[PDB]
């Protein structure tokens, strides 16, 4: 992907994460947990279902067309009919082939992008209280119990509360 998160600095996905596309995994003094992130999940899903909807409905409402099957050759007029139908099928096959390749390259970049937005969002909440470890993980330089963790996950973490503690841990 263009952003290098999925199959990049996140080395793999989590099979244990079964209730969202993206989420958080932590370790603090009282244990470990895995929780889904709803916003990032929903953003990815919305952009993909949108793709699907535009796609699945075409309108190809055709009735009287031309003959496409022949028992014996007749020459000029029949050649032209076969050539017209064969030309049409190749162009539509090309269109289908290109369409799916474009859509898939985009889908993969969107999902890598959303992973990156999620990581960047948490990086911004954490301010000077944490350091990027390089594998999609932050080392948090202050005590962070289950309520603290959940405040990071739900967007209410207030970096000022723990800054003095974290600054002192980071540089001495």
């Amino acid at each position: 992907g263009l952003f290098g998160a999925i199959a990049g600095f996140i080395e793999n996905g989590w099979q244990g994460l079964i209730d969202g596309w993206y989420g958080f995994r932590h370790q603090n003094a009282e244990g470990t947990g895995t929780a889904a992130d709803l916003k990032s999940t929903q953003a990815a899903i919305d952009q993909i279902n949108g793709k699907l909807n535009r796609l699945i409905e075409k309108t190809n409402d055709k009735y009287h067309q031309i003959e496409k099957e022949f028992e014996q050759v007749e020459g000029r007029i029949q050649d032209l009919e076969k050539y017209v139908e064969d030309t049409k099928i190749d162009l539509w096959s090309y269109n289908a082939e290109l369409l799916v390749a474009l859509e898939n390259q985009h889908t993969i970049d969107v999902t890598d992008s959303e992973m990156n937005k999620l990581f960047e969002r948490v990086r911004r909440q954490l301010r000077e209280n944490a350091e990027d470890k390089g594998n999609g993980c932050f080392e948090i330089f202050h005590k962070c119990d289950n309520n603290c963790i959940e405040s990071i996950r739900n967007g209410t973490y207030d970096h000022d509360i723990y800054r003095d503690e974290a600054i002192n841990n980071r540089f001495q």
Binding site: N60, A96, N104
Partner: protein, 319 residues
């Protein structure tokens, strides 16, 4: 400082391979197939109107061959024409066969209108052993076989039908080809015969065609069938010195022709679908199909590929 928080994404054990611009095989968590490759083994009678020709193809249905009375008055979106249809009448050909079959199929109904043609002194309603109706000699019930009077008299014929109705008319008429000059003379007196049909805007003339021909249904004789479309305000004139297979009237044309024909053996069933292929109906939401190029109605687009997977999820990287 020592607690750790990690941002991640889901994965499953075994994902689906897709193609991108770059790669022929990328594994993603989910995908959706965009090519329909399954069909129903039946044709759906709803919501499009299907009419089954059964033993008649559409040309025989129009001519009124034995076995085709069930098609009288019939209206269709799609005429279903069976590969195993069979001629039940006098051996015949249509010089522009596919063009007439197209016009009938497109038109979309068999709405026949009887007219009376006051043919002079010639004997009407000729029948044949090659066109049995319930073991009785008969003919195309939409055509009228004319022959000489009992006292040898096939005079020049000259009748006109004027169109002052609010719809175009389709007249189907024909020309009989004896296999000897002896046959010619005992049927139509004169030799050669000849038909010429005309409108304000056109003109046709057929010279009958005498010669030995292979036996079809026990006969060497033939009928060549033609047609004439007569718009409102125009007229049709029939001229004969012999050999005319005359019309009993005309078919109505719709102003707007929106129907078509599908040649298939597939049985009509009980399902619902608006997409019909010659391999049967399609019941799908997919945008493409590889089942048949022959497809009628509201169909996915036909393509050569057997499969095209659309990714509906991210790269799958398990563990």
């Amino acid at each position: 400082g020592n607690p750790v928080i990690c941002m991640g994404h889901h994965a499953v054990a075994n994902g689906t391979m897709v193609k991108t611009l770059a790669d022929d095989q990328v594994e993603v968590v989910t995908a959706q197939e965009l090519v329909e490759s399954q069909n129903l083994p039946e044709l759906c009678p709803s919501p499009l109107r299907l009419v089954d020709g059964q033993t008649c193809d559409i040309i025989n249905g129009a001519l009124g061959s034995p076995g085709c009375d069930h098609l009288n008055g019939a209206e269709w979106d799609v005429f279903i024409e069976r590969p195993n249809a069979v001629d039940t009448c006098y051996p015949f050909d249509v010089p522009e066969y596919q063009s007439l079959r197209s016009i009938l199929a497109n038109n979309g109904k068999f709405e026949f209108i009887a007219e009376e043609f006051q043919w002079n002194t010639v004997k009407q309603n000729g029948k044949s052993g090659a066109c049995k109706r319930a073991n009785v000699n008969d003919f195309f019930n939409r055509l009228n076989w004319l022959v000489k009077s009992d006292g040898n008299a096939y005079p020049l014929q000259n009748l006109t039908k004027i169109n002052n109705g609010d719809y175009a008319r389709l007249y189907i008429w024909g020309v009989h080809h004896p296999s000897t000059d002896t046959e010619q003379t005992n049927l139509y007196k004169n030799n050669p015969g000849g038909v010429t049909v005309s409108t304000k805007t056109s003109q046709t003339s057929v010279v009958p065609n005498i010669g030995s021909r292979p036996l079809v249904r026990g006969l060497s004789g033939r009928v060549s069938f033609y047609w004439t479309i007569v718009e409102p305000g125009d007229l049709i004139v029939f001229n004969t010195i012999g050999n005319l297979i005359a019309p009993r009237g005309h078919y109505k044309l719709n102003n707007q022709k929106k129907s078509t024909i599908l040649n298939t053996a597939i049985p009509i069933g009980s399902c619902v679908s608006k997409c019909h292929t010659d391999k049967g109906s399609l019941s799908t939401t997919k945008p493409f199909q590889n089942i048949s190029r022959i497809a009628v109605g509201d169909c996915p687009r036909y393509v050569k590929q057997g499969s095209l997977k659309l990714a509906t999820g991210m790269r799958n990287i398990p563990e």
